[PDB]
Amino acid sequence: GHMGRVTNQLQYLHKVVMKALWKHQFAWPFRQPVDAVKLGLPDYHKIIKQPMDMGTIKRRLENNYYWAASECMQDFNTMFTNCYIYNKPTDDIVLMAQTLEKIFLQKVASMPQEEQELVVT
Numbered sequence: 347g348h349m350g351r352v353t354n355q356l357q358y359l360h361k362v363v364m365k366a367l368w369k370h371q372f373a374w375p376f377r378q379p380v381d382a383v384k385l386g387l388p389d390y391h392k393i394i395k396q397p398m399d400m401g402t403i404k405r406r407l408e409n410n411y412y413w414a415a416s417e418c419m420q421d422f423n424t425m426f427t428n429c430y431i432y433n434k435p436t437d438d439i440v441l442m443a444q445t446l447e448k449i450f451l452q453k454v455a456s457m458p459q460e461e462q463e464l465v466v467t
């Protein structure tokens with residue numbers, strides 16, 4: 347019971363935002379879902395109810411899964427927040443998320459302000 351589309355903001359999130367974040371030095375733990383068995387975190391899925399990662403976001407952008415840019419921005423917010431709330435403040439993963447979230451926020455500030463659907467053939 348869901349469908350997506352191509353908007354100017356969603357295209358910006360794919361072509362500008364995801365391009366800057368995907369290739370970053372600190373992106374590698376965020377490129378695929380948190381593997382709690384590999385990491386030895388048996389409480390992860392008890393605490394985190396909505397896991398999210400950049401690989402899922404990228405795939406969703408490529409397959410036009412989102413109806414609006416706000417849904418994609420929520421996925422980014424969830425991914426960063428999951429990381430901060432679950433982990434210890436002294437874990438380096440926290441600083442890696444902080445570095446990427448700062449880039450994310452700056453790019454969102456430069457996004458075209460009004461959401462419009464595009465005709466993409």
Ligand SMILES: Cc1noc(C)c1-c1cc(C(N)=O)c2c(c1)c1ccc(C(=O)N3C[C@@H](C)O[C@@H](C)C3)cc1n2CC1CC1
Pocket residue numbers: 374375376377378379380381382384385428429433439
């Ligand atoms: C994100 C995130 N939020 O909370 C946590 C915890 C995470 C989060 C998520 C993942 C994941 N996606 O499963 C994850 C890590 C942290 C993580 C930390 C360290 C190492 C590690 O020790 N390495 C790998 C490095 C390439 O080389 C070293 C030599 C050894 C692997 C890790 N992975 C595995 C991923 C590479 C596939």
